[PDB]
């Protein structure tokens, strides 16, 4: 499976390394709380 925030899994096993993907979550929901911009996301 890859989410695409540095995950990396195909048999052996996974190694989605929790650190970096927080941090662009904080930013991804910033936008929502400011509302200073358009989006035509799914909803």
């Known amino acids: ?3 695409g925030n540095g995950v ?3 048999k052996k ?3 989605v390394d929790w ?3 927080i ?3 904080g930013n ?3 936008a929502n ?3 200073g911009g358009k989006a035509g996301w799914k909803g």
Request: aromatic share 10%; glycine share 14%.
């Open 8 to 10: 990396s899994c195909n």
């Open 19 to 21: 650190g970096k993907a």
């Open 28 to 30: 991804n929901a910033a």
């Open 23 to 25: 941090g662009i979550i």
């Open 1 to 3: 499976k890859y989410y």
């Open 33 to 35: 709380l400011t509302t």
């Open 13 to 15: 096993g996974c190694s």
